Design a protein around this ligand. Structure first.
Ligand SMILES: [Co+2]
Ligand SMILES: [Co+2]
Length: 465
């Protein structure tokens, strides 16, 4: 059995879930880079973004009580939710310095209606018996922090997002403000979510449709380092107001080489994708949030590319990992999701071992899930990834929970509503949430704290390791 303290739950963000009534001006958060990005004509006409709009979404801002009750009804004991910086501080905090009197000046400029709303939502979680896990940043940034169109077009701006040295400083102010206001109800803190994704998709792998979509390898590394500085500052600032655990939620990639005897490229890819950032924050983490979807298979680049800050001597092989046919199969034979992501739960076991060996911190799986609107695989995904967790734990790895991504279908960034990751189907016309069959399997595992009753049926051969 998993320990009674092991957390079963789900993860959500603010932007992908909160909005749902386009005509409520207090709910409509017009002031993020992402909000404007998804309606940009260049992006729309070129299919860089989907055409779907987040204000037509799942309506967590208004329907939180029903979503919290769904979570308890399906056996969850914890939800991780996002707070949008843009909602708390719609206007710049750049004129309010660190020091004596900072918190009171920030309270005078903060959007207290948003602060009170987040409070109500977390009070509801608490009333329902759910542990409150707050993550302070989840990709979106306030428009006074990031003007993605000025950046995209190379036009002068101070609003450079994570490239601006001002950003980590303002973020530290925001983190301290929130910890000061909510230290009495938050059980667990994360500074930010998948910072390597923000940096890599923003400034390096610019075919994913993320802001500012400006290829600059130096800005890739700079935004990554500025995010690590932001985390470190945030940890110190939150800890002024609480002794509760503070960590970061990171997207880890497992790499397999195409050919044997390529350990150099393995270590290079692991460092760039995982260890570069994590080594910068390692002195200021009480736990590591492991987000895991699939692996990448890599091979040696005939001609390495040298950048100012790093060498690239490998490339990503098509047909495995994140690079499979959407709704098809990997070259391995494994099914792939409707995002083209191979089912590879052994990657999570390998990473739990590697991460624990490197850092020796408690781990929580903070995201794992699949784009699967017909529920073809999601039960086996849950079971086989928990099999991975159990195997790691059996070998002495300290894992404290599993939060699925996600409890409901939501707005998947540049793909919009086209990728459906929910345990429950979201009817976006009625704003109602209908548990898929896999959500009953999740409830069974959470309630019994076991997968032993599932293990002997393995139709996709996912638990043979
Ligand atoms: Co309300
Ligand atoms: Co292979």
């Amino acid at each position: 059995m998993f320990p009674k303290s092991f957390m079963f739950g789900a993860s959500l963000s603010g932007f992908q879930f909160e909005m749902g009534n386009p005509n409520d001006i207090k709910e409509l958060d017009t002031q993020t880079d992402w909000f404007v990005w998804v309606r940009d004509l260049e992006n729309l006409l070129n299919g860089i973004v989907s055409g779907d709009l987040p204000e037509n979404g799942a309506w967590y801002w208004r329907n939180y009580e029903k979503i919290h009750q769904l979570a308890v009804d399906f056996g969850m004991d914890t939800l991780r939710i996002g707070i949008e910086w843009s909602r708390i501080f719609p206007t710049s905090t750049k004129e309010i310095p660190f020091g004596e009197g900072m918190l009171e000046k920030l309270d005078e400029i903060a959007n207290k209606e948003a602060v009170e709303h987040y409070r109500k939502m977390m009070e509801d979680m608490k009333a329902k018996g759910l542990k409150v896990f707050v993550n302070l940043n989840h990709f979106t940034l306030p428009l006074w922090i990031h003007d993605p169109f000025a950046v995209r077009k190379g036009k002068p701006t101070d609003k450079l997002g994570w490239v601006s040295d001002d950003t980590p400083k303002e973020f530290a102010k925001y983190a301290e403000y929130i910890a000061w206001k909510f230290s009495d109800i938050v059980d667990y803190w994360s500074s930010m979510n998948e910072p390597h994704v923000v940096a890599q998709l923003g400034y390096f792998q610019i075919m994913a449709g993320f802001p500012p979509n400006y290829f600059n390898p130096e800005w890739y590394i700079k935004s990554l380092k500025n995010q690590a500085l932001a985390h470190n500052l945030a940890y110190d600032a939150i800890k002024k107001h609480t002794d509760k655990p503070v960590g970061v939620i990171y997207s880890f990639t497992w790499f397999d080489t195409l050919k044997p005897n390529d350990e150099e490229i393995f270590e290079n890819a692991m460092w760039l994708a995982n260890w570069n950032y994590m080594d910068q924050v390692k002195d200021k983490i009480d736990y590591i949030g492991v987000n895991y979807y699939t692996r990448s298979v890599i091979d040696k680049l005939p001609t390495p590319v040298n950048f100012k800050d790093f060498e690239l001597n490998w490339y990503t092989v098509r047909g495995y990992g994140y690079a499979c046919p959407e709704g098809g199969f990997a070259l391995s034979g494994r099914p792939a999701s409707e995002f083209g992501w191979e089912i590879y739960p052994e990657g999570l076991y390998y990473l739990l071992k590697a991460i624990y060996e490197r850092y020796n911190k408690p781990l929580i799986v903070t995201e794992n899930g699949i784009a699967d609107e017909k529920d073809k695989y999601r039960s086996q995904v849950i079971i086989s990834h928990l099999y991975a967790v159990e195997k790691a734990m059996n070998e002495g790895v300290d894992v404290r929970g599993y939060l699925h991504w996600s409890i409901i279908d939501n707005y998947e960034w540049a793909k919009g509503y086209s990728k459906r990751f929910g345990l429950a189907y979201t009817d976006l016309e009625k704003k109602t949430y209908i548990p898929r069959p896999s959500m009953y399997v999740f409830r069974e595992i959470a309630r019994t704290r076991s997968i032993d009753q599932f293990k002997g049926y393995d139709p996709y051969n996912l638990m043979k390791f």
